[PDB]
Structure formats: C-alpha cells, structure tokens
Amino acid sequence: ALTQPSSVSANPGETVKITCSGDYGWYQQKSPGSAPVTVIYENNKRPSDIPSRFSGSKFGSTHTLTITGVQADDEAVYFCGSRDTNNGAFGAGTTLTVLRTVAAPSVFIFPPSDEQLKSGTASVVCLLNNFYPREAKVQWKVDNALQSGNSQESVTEQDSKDSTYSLSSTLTLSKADYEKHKVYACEVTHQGLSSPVTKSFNRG
Amino acid sequence: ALTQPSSVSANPGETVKITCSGGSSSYYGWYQQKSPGSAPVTLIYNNQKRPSDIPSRFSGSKSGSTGTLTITGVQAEDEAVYFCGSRDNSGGIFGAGTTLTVLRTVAAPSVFIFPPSDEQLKSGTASVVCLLNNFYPREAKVQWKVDNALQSGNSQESVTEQDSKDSTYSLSSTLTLSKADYEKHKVYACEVTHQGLSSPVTKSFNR
Amino acid sequence: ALTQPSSVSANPGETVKITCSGSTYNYGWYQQKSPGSAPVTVIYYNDKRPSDIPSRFSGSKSGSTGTLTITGVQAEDEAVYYCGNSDSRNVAFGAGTTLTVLRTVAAPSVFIFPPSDEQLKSGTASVVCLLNNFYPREAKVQWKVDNALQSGNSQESVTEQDSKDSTYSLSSTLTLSKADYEKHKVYACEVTHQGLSSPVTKSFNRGEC
Amino acid sequence: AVTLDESGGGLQTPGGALSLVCKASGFDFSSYAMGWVRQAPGKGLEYVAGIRNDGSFTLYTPAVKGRATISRDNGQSTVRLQLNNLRAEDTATYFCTKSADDGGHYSDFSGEIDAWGHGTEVIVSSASTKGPSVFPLAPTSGGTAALGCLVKDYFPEPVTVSWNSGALTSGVHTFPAVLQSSGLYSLSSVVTVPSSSLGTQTYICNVNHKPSNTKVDKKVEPK
Amino acid sequence: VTLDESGGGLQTPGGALSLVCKGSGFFSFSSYTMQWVRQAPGKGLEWVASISSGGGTNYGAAVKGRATISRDNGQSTLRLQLNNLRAEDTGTYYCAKHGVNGCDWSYSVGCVDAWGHGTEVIVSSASTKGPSVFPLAPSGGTAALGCLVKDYFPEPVTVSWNSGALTSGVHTFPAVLQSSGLYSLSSVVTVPSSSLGTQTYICNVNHKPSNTKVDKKVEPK
Amino acid sequence: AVTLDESGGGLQTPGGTLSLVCKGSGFTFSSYEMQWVRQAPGKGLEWVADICIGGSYTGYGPAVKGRATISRDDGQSTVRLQLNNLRAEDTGTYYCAKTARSDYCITGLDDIDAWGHGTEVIVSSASTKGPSVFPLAPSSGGTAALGCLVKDYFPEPVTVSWNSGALTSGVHTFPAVLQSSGLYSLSSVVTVPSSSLGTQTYICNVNHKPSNTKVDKKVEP
Amino acid sequence: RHVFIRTELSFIKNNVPCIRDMFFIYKRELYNICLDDLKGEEDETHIYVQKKVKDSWITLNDLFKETDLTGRPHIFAYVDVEEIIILLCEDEEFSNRKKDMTCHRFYSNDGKEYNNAEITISDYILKDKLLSSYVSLPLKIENREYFLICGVSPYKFKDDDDILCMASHDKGETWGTKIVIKYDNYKLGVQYFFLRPYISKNDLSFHFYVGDNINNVKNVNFIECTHEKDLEFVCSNRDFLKDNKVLQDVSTLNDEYIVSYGNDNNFAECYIFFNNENSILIKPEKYGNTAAGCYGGTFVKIDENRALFIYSSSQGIYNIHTIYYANY
Ligand SMILES: [Ca+2]
Ligand SMILES: [Ca+2]
C-alpha cells in the first residue's frame, strides 16, 4: 500500500511536488492503456531522454517528484514504485490536472442512424466538447420528462494541447420506445454555463 | 500483520486452499482448532513440515511473503478454525484463523420449545428455551412472540460447532423474563425462519 | 515518515498513550510547553527516563511503533510532545502531539482596557481585550465599534496552559489610528466561549471616569 | 550539572553566514554525539546537523545540505555550526543537543537526546533594530482587578517583562508578541491583583529589551 | 513429548500469576525454544512470550513490561510470572514448543510443533459460584429433552449425559456470559418418543471450581 | 535504442492458461532483471512477476501466486508468461520491464528504465461479436462535427484511424462503456469547418482484431 | 596410493567494486558479501549479498541498508545445511568501550529473501577485544552447535586469556557462551590480525597474520586447537614454513591440509600443496593480464574433495581455480 495523492493541481510555469510515502521510482502514463515512461529511475536518477525540469528527492521514507516549471506536455497520471513489507508494489496514481481558465462545452446531439433502426435498437448520443473543469451534468428529457437509469456517460482524459475534456452520454432505448416520442432534449449543466444549454431534435 | 480469510467453503472431496499473507519471515505455520476451548494442533510447521498423525491431504506451501495450506481432498472432519503463525518485527504474529465450512444438502431444523421448570419459577426468574436441531446452513432467525408481541433485548443465542459426521448445526435461544412477567402472558410462541423451511415454523405452548 | 497524532486529549488521572510510527530503532520523546522554549527530554532510548522526570512517564517500542504512556495525567503534563528516531537511515522528528488536559469547563474573566493618556499623544490608540483563566483553548473574540463588526485589524495572543490549574489566557488587540479613535465612542468586545451560554460583551465609553 | 550554552545566534543577513557555537559542561564531552535542531516560527521541530563522538561522522538536513558544516572541538568542549548563503527559510530558534550515545546508529541523533540548551533566535532579514514603547493598561470593578503593560513596536525578539523587580510572580501572565503588518512586535503582560490592593500598592512593570539595549520601567496607575 | 502447563486459575485483578509448563518425554529440552501463547474468549490466537536455548527472552506487545518467562532446564519446566492482571489477560493459556531444527527468530510462531492442554486463566474479583440445574422435559417418532445449567462462575462446566452412556443425539451448547456476570449453558439430547417411558435420562453436571456435582433426572410432567 | 515488443492479444476462456512473450532488443539481455506489470481497466499498476539474470530467482505477485510462471529464453531474448486458472481479475493490458542496473536483482520497483508497448488480454467465454459501424451526421454555421459509432462489439480493443492515418488534427477518441446487455460502445469524432463539406471525403476506418473485420464507412451529411 | 588432483580456471566479472570480499558456499553455489564503500560526492556505503550465476556476480539484497548502523560494521556471517545467518556488529574506535555490542541479525533459507532485526549483546564477553570480519559455520562441542564470534588482545607485555570467542546455540541471538583459547606462544610485544576460525568436522583451528616488529610485514600463522574440559581449548602452532615461499591460506580436503603459498610477499605466482606432496602452480597471467598476481588468494571449501582458490588479479575480475582432490 504505497500512499500517493489521488490528484494534484498546479498552473503552468510553476513548480509541482508529488509525495509518495508508502527506494522510489516514478513512472508517467498519459492515457490508460498507453505504455508508461520512466520519469525518474531511482531516488535521484533521471533517464537521458527526460527533461531537466524533472527531479527527485527522498527524505526518510517519503519521496517527492518535483516538476520545476510545468508545461502542457506534462499532463499525465504519475505512479510511484517501491517495496512495502517484503513485497514490491506500485502507488494508487496521482493525476496531474493543470490549472487553466473555465471553458464551456460545445454540445452536439446525434440521432440514431437508418441502419441502427433496422437492427432493433436506437441510441441517441449527446456529445460535449472541449470544456473545463471535469465536473459536468447531463440530463435527458424525452418529451419534457426526466430520464434516469438508462444513460451511460464516457469522459476522456485531459487534452495535451489545450487542457480540455469531452463527454459522451448515450441514451439507450428500444426500437419500440423510440418511435413513441418526437422531441429528445439534452439539458447540459456546467460551471461555465449560467443557463443550461438544451440541444433538442425532432423525429421528422 | 498476517492477513488470511475469515471463511472458506468446500464440498467433500474437493481440494481447498487457505492463504496467509504478510510478515517479515522465512517460515509460516498452520494450526487447527476444532472448538474455541480446544487446544491447537499443528498441521504444518516451518512452511511444509508435517507433524505425526496429520493426513497426507494437509500440504504446506510458501510463495514469497505468503504461506498456503492445501487440503487435497477435503473430509467432513476438516471443519475447524485454521490459524497461521509467522514473524513480524514486533514478535510472533497470528492470522484471524480461517473457518472452514463443509458444504452439504439444505436441511430444515427440528424446532422445539421448553417451558420453565416450576422449581425455577419459585426462584423468581423464568427461562423459556427454543431448540433448533441438526440443520443446514447456520443462517437462521429466531423471534420470540409473547402474547403475539416481538421480544427484543431480552433473549440470547448460543450456537454449537458444525458436526463432523453430518455437517449440520444447533441453536439455543434463551428468553429470560421475571416470574411475574411469565404468569401474566399465556401464549408463548417461538417463530423460526430458515432456508430449509418453506414457511416459518412456530413451536408454541400455553402456560 | 515518523507519523504522530496531531492532538490527543484526556481527563486528569486517565492514562494517556501517544503513538509514533515509521521507525524500528531508538525512540526519544521530548516535551515543549510553549513554541520557542527549550524542550525537555521525557524519555530517551525507547524507555529510559531521566532522573528529574516523574515516574508517571514511561515508554515502549513494538515493531516500528513507539508509545509514550503517561499513567495518571496532571496539569504540567500539557505540552506538544515530539517523537524522535531514525526514519530510514535519516535523523527525523515527528509532527507533534499536543496534550490538551480535559479539566472541567472554565469561563474566561473578561477585562477591557482603554488606550493610555501617553499613548494618545504618540499618535496611536490600541484597545486591549483580556481573556483570563479558561478551558478549552477554543475561543472567539469579535470587536464592535459603535455596534459595527470589525475584521482584519485585530491580533490575538494565546498563552501556554497553566501548570497548576490548567487554564488559558487570550490577548486580543484592536489597532486603530489616533484619528479613527476619536471619531467613535462605544467600544464593545463580544466574547464567545464554549462555557458561555450568552456572549459576555464588555464595553467602555470614550472619556468616562 | 549538565549545561549547553548557545553562543552566536541573533540577527543575521540574507546571503550571509553564521557561526553558532555551543559550550558543554558537566559530562565527558569526547564520548557523546552532538547535534543542532531548529524550530521555524509556526512550524515543528527539525534536525539540522549531527556529529559523532570522534567527529568522524556528520549528517545534514536536505535543506542545509552543501551549505552547513558542523564541526567540534573535544579539547575545548565546543560544537560550532557554520551555515552559508542564509535564506529567509533559515529563520528559526536553534537548540544545541546532546545524545546519550556515541552516534553509532542514526537513531542516536534524534531519538536518544538526554540534554538540551536554552536556544538562540536566529533571524535572517536586512532590517534594523527598534526600541519598545511601553504604554500602561489602566483598570470596571469586582472581587479581583487586572492591570498590565503594552510593549508595542519593537524588533527583533525576545523581550523580558517582570513585575515589581521580580517581587510579583503569582498571577503574572506574559503573552507572546504578535508580529504586526509593519514587521514589529506587540507583546503584552498582565497581572491579576486584588481589587482592594488598587492604589495602596505600587505596580511597576520592568520591560528589558536586549537587542536595542532599551530598559523601560512603567508605573501602571488606576483612575 | 507432552507439555503440562498448570498453575493458573481465577486470579484477582492487579496481581501476580505464575504458571508452570511441565515438560515430559524430552530429549535435551535445553535445545528447544519454548513459548507461551494465549486465546481470550471468542478471540483468536496471541503470542505471549518466547525463550531461546541461550535464554533469548521476547514478550508480546500486549504483556511486555510486566511479564517474565523463564526455563528451569534441569526439571524441563517453562514458567511465566505476569503482574498487574487485567481483563485483556483473561483466556486460555497454551504452552508451545518450537520444532527441533528451529525457526528464523526464536519469537516466531511459524515453527510450533507441540501444544499443551491449556490452563484457563480468569482475571476477576467475583468469587466462585455453582450452577442451578433445571429440566427441559419432553412433550410417536422422535422427541427432544435437555437440562439447563443456570448460574455459575468461572466458565468450565461438564455435562455428562446418562453417566457417559448417552452421547448420540447430545448437543451440549457453549455457555453464555449473562447480563449479571455468571454463565448459562444448555445441554440438550434428541431421543425417540417410544423410549421416553422405558428410559431414565440423567443430567450429569459438574462444576470443578466450586465442586458442584449436580445430578438431575429429566422426566415429562 | 531499446525496444520491447509483446506477443499477440488474447481472449481465452476462464480457468485456462495464458501465454505471453517480450521480444527484447537494443540492449544486452541476460544481464538485466526482467519483470511483468499488468494494468486493470481504469485501475493502477500491479507488478506480476520478476525473474533474475540467468533465471536464478523467480518471484510472483499476490493475485498470481501459485498460478504465474516466468521463463527467460536468453538465446531468443524473450520473457515468457504462463498463467493458469484464469479469472475475471486477470483482464487488462500487460507490459514488460527492464531494470536499469546490470547484474542487479534487489527486490523493489524503483529501478525500471524500459517499458513495452503493451498487449490486451480479456478473460471471457463469450463469442467475438462483429463490429457495427454507423454514420452520424449533423442536421452549425462555422464548425461542423462529423463522426462514427461502434456498437455491439466484443472484446476490446479497436483502432480507428481517419484517412488511414493522414487526418490526426482534431480527432478525439472516446473510451468504450459496458452497456446493459453486456457489450461495449466506442465513439470517435473529428472537428472540421463547414467550408469543407462537399470538397473533402472523410472515411471512418474501424479495425477489430479478435474478429478480423475492416469496414470502411463514409460519413456524409 | 591413488592421488587424483584436477584444476580448471574460470572468470567472474563484477560490475560493482568491492573494497573487501567475503566468499561463502551455500546449497552448492558461490556467494560474496561485497563492501561497496566509495568515497565521493554521491558514493555511499552498501553491503551486498551476491551470487555468481554464470561468469558474473549477480547482486542480490543490500543487507546493510536496513541497519541503523552509521558506518563500517563487522561482518560475521555463518552457513548451515539449510540457512544462512549474518551479523553487522559495531566497531570500537579509540575508546568505544561499549560494554554491550549492537549488531543486526540477517536470516535466510535461500540466500535471497533476507529478514532482519537488531540484536544487542549486553555485557558481551569480548569487551575491549579487537575484531576482524569473517565467514564461518557451526562448530560442534559436546553435542551442541555453536556459531563463534572470536577476537584478539591489542598488546602484550604482562604474562597470562589472550584470544577468545563468544558463542551462540540459537542461530546467533544469544552470546553468553564463553570459549577459552590457550595459545601459549603469544610472545611479548606481538599483535595478531584478521583472526578467522577455520572450522572442519568439529575441529577448531585459527588462521591469523602477525605484524612483525623487526620486519614491517604480516606473516601468516595457523594453530590447531585441542579440546580439554567442556568449553576449554588449548591451541598449538602447526608449522608450514616452506623454503623460499610465503604461507598464505590453509584449508582441508580428505582430512589433509591444502595449503596456499606465494613466491614472495608480492605474490607473482602461487602454489597449492595437497598433504605436502603434490603441488600445482597457478599462473595469474590468464585473461591477458600483464599487471597480475595472486595477493589475497583464498579457499572456499565446497566438499571434503572440492574447494575453490579465488583471487582478484585486477578490479572487477575474479580468477576461479576449481580444485578437486581425492587421495585414497
Ligand atoms: Ca551506537
Ligand atoms: Ca544506540
């Protein structure tokens, strides 16, 4: 059980300090599934192909990864690696969210395709694009009625060019229940929106 | 700092495995206790060494900082608490002890009710007893219904160990009331809710 | 690192136990009554106790955790206790465990003081609100110049608990210029404590008596 | 009688250096490991530099590493700490400590200390010394009346306030100085005397400020 | 080898306790590492103390400071003096032997091959109490009876049915600590209805600390 | 110039075995310690197994204890990973690692200086469902949004590339979610201005490796 | 008579510098306890257990990192038929008359997975007795197995007691057992160095250098210790002086001394003598080595027949003389 903060947040140009208190090795992983890269290969050792901004320091049983001057290419989940009692293990992961200005999501509603209807299913997809912060609310309104339990959202990792998020909510409904209604609204509630933007479309 | 399970369940004939994890040691050890008052019996000492009169089905194992007991071909008589013992930087550490449960068919309990002896009433106290006999599994509910009213906070439960021949249980519920409280009510029902019973069996008397 | 509780609290006579974890070598406990004052070694070398230290103080190590036991705690035993050891071949101290002694709830005796005649001639006028002998340390001091809430211009000073009756004393000071002091007249001092059902407000008139 | 006399810790300057010496007596100096600890204001304890009995081994806190140089003279019974390029973060009270061991194990340094010193307030700033202005706090009536003195506007710390030339001890409370928005200190000292003793008994607060060599005696009188 | 730990019982709180584990059938007992392990009621196993062949003494975090383990090699005995007794100090005490070849550290519990019978140590100021036996009489086919042992202290009570002859059907329950402080235990037995009249069923209760050999006869009213 | 390549992806049935391999290059294999590290869906990094220089020492992780088996083939420069009794927990992306120090085998995860690309393993006994690609067209003014949808496909992963890798700017890939029926739903959109609606051709190329299905769906509004 | 000598030369590369080396055999495999104590800006102290896998030393745990030890500790390591127990005891710089010793204890049933806990030999027998690190194994004295920490007296001018050991019969946790060594040839004004106990078949013997006052060189000495009453031992000097050769190391095979000799104190060439009958000359100029010799030539017994002869003719290079002998 290597103690490591759930998340850390610092603005660009500023220094960042990540503590692992559970010798220590730091490995960055940009997106879940992508191959991680060793940022610091010991307490005070850095690989050749790694920027000089990255540095490490161990004091007692606590290590701190110091990113003196942070950029947008440093947006990744950092992991510490060491040994607990006898065995070897990794940290929980520190997600590095970079401090930026409040962005509003560009909402685009999509209707089920002509090929989808023939199969027997019809899912309406509500897309959100380039927004900050990650906190967002998506509510469905089929003919001005609240829908709950039949919607699954998908949030992407922070972009490495502009530090923005993108959401993908999907309303799963059967072919029979889709043809019974005409108006499909999408109430989007974000921090950067004073009035919730509702994008609606007609069946015809 | 030894972390081993609380429960493990096996049908007779199957091979079972208990995993004891943690500690800064070179050796682990498994100890069996049948009942809580029972003295421990070493099954495997020093990771794999098996003391005399311990079956071959009892196997010792150790991968890294994790010892493992393997019961290759479980028998009904293997129902017991299985503690693991090792070494920490503090001293000798033990495990929570994994209670082995032997699986068998679903049995309905033999519900019985016992009024207080008239010799006991003269003392001032009245103990009403409900007996659940040779049932499976241990998960049962006992509700006391004095004159059709739920009795809470005045009854205690006692459960015997699982049998090593039939692998069934037994539960005694003792409702303790005052002599006056007993004579004032007439109908003394004991509702027993179990999985083996389609409808809750209520054993009752009238005194 | 050498993790040690932020604070611990018990009634006089109760046994107190302070844990320090993250090292398996020689623990050393050092008490410090007030920040800045020279600390005094309570227990050194895990359990060894200096001659001039009470018998109620004892120490014990189990694995990588040490526990300072104070059997039957008294008034003087209030202090920030610091643990010391090697944390992974590094010499380091703990965060500090503060000992607040749970004695009966005491109410503060409030005394408001006006700026002196000498003070006014210099060009400054500081009003001092004095809280004395109270428990616990949690207290609220709010200033009211002519029934108006004052914030940002008041600095409080809390003393180290008393070694005989276990009481605290607070010293809030309202810093105002000579020009702003003569423009107002009624100076109230709303004191909100746990042992006070109604906040005692001590007020004084400018130029009276 | 074991003593630890710190000598050389006061007002220092940014980028500069210090030479904190410690004098020890009452024990065999050449057999115990010695060290220096520091408490930053508003912060906890922190080991600075440790030195072995034979002076052959030294250790430094990552903050002072490469700038500090703990030395020791067993013959003279001293342990001099030299710190260079003094930062704002180096403002703290420095205590000379004594381990009850040779320093054979790392824990001997912070977990086996059987002797401490008074301390020395080390301040790292390019600022000048000021003199305190003691204003009385005149006494509202009851069973027990309080009175005090206001040691306002002084730099740096500390200040020693006594009552009636060391005669009044019971009921005297000395409150720590609050650092003002201008950079000065506002210490206050009150004393709870009987309500009947007002007027008939004289009360003169003696404030002694060592940095500016200021010594002001003020008579607090009720009206 | 046989381990006979004895010398423990109902002790008064805040006092001393010397148990003695009598080693029998040992060959060079001196060589073995000797141990003490305890089990509080309804709790698990706890290491108490160890002693290596050279006198290597180590005590469990729970008892360190007031405990003292020793070995009288000559008489093959293992002893344990424990002062200032508490409720945490209640439970059975088992005497353990470490395997012949040894272990990593003498204070380990991964190398015990031999255990003793167990001396139950009870720390309490309440004095001995004998129980009160009361019947649980019966009402074709199968039927059930039993007999309630009511108020006793300390915990060991032995209910032999029909002087040992009756064991089939017998379910002696595990005693409960009542609100009061004393224990109530309930031994029952399942028999056929045809045998009710033809057979006599005797409760054979036995409380050792208070010498209460009670012998009740359960019969229908 | 270190390159770590992995064996082909898997979708084996539970209770079975799993075989993996790491083709190492650009360094002196058989002088560095090698290890395996798995990553569960949306979870942290879990060390699986470490093998010393000359296969002298072996060590496995807690979840794969008594099931995992490593095999470094020095002549082939490949590390094998055997895993019997497959469970749901074993589903995830697996990586290979190389310690930084030569002739060094201390236990600890602070020394890895090389990482493999990764390969996916899905423990499930379900049939590989064919991917269905549906075109999504908007009904914007300045910036228009075109994309495609992959529904009713199993198991992961799916590589979607616009114009066979030519169009990379403004391409967002969304992770798949487990629907109520038990299938995944992946989506991908590309932000292009309204002036290019007619003069350019956008084709969403979906690739499903377990079922071998390559359908080129064009998206037209 | 059937002599059966058989040598094969091999090499081991160590990427880790070792100020000192300690070789031991366990489970029929060769291990080294390396002291990597470099004295530079980032160079720290490490004590590594290292096992040779092919033609190169593989670094296993660094045992020293656990010890709160502040510096160079004494290494007394012991091997048994199924375990290895090691200790890092404290030194006595000037008057470090630490009336009690403080070493660590490390334990393994594989030489890899090592477990540790600090031990304390309060009021230890070997107070003010100088120490020198070494590898050893259990000696049997009166059906009891003992690991031995043996030391020596600094100077001698008053006739006597002058060499002694403490012992453990609980895998090196208790050291209350005092073994006496009665070597009556401790001349007036002599000092013994690097004292290591050669143990074999429960027969006690010692190999130690002697810093000659007249000369300025250290001369090897080997004594045979005979058991008198329980725990009492009287030793005697076994002579090995050879015409124009210097004594170096000493072992036993077939219950016969296998001794080591150099041409001169610089050791350009080394010679091994099986029962003072058969010689073998080991030419250290193997692996293309101009600047080569056999200084620090050592024996690692592996069997009553096998034993290796190892030296380092340059840094990070080990010359393995694989000896086999069978006089029957
Ligand atoms: Ca020491
Ligand atoms: Ca020490």
Residue numbers in the entry:
A (entry chain E): 23 to 44, 48 to 229
B (entry chain C): 23 to 229
C (entry chain G): 23 to 231
D (entry chain F): 20 to 158, 163 to 246
E (entry chain B): 21 to 159, 165 to 246
F (entry chain D): 20 to 158, 163 to 244
G (entry chain A): 31 to 190, 194 to 361
The article reads:
The leading vaccine candidates for a P. falciparum blood-stage malaria vaccine are members of a heterotrimeric complex containing reticulocyte-binding protein homolog 5 (RH5), cysteine-rich protective antigen (CyRPA), and RH5-interacting protein (RIPR), collectively called the “RCR complex”. Each member of this complex is highly conserved, essential for erythrocyte invasion, and capable of inducing cross-strain neutralizing antibodies. The leading blood-stage malaria vaccine candidate, CyRPA, is essential for invasion of Plasmodium falciparum into human erythrocytes.
To determine the molecular basis for improved binding kinetics, we determined a crystal structure of CyRPA in complex with the Fab fragments of Cy.003, Cy.004, and Cy. The conformation of CyRPA and the location and nature of the epitopes for the three antibodies were largely unchanged from those observed in structures of CyRPA bound to single antibodies, with the exception of Cy.004, which showed a small rotation. Based on this structure, hydrogen bonding via side chain-side chain and side chain-main chain interactions likely stabilize antibody binding, thereby slowing dissociation. CDR loops from neighbouring mAbs play a critical role in these interactions, with both CDR:CDR interactions (LCDR1 of Cy.003 to LCDR3 of Cy.007, and LCDR1 of Cy.004 to LCDR3 of Cy.003), as well as CDR interactions with framework (LCDR3 of Cy.007 to Cy.003 framework and LCDR3 of Cy.004 to Cy.007 framework) forming these interacting interfaces. Lateral interactions also occurred between framework regions, with both heavy and light chain frameworks of Cy.003 interacting with the frameworks of Cy.004 and Cy.007 light chains. Therefore, in each case, antibody synergy is associated with stronger binding to CyRPA and slower dissociation of the antibodies from CyRPA. The most striking finding from this study is our identification of lateral heterotypic Fab–Fab interactions between antibodies that bind to neighbouring epitopes. We also show that pairs of antibodies that make such lateral interactions synergize with one another, with both improved stability of their complex with CyRPA and improved GIA.
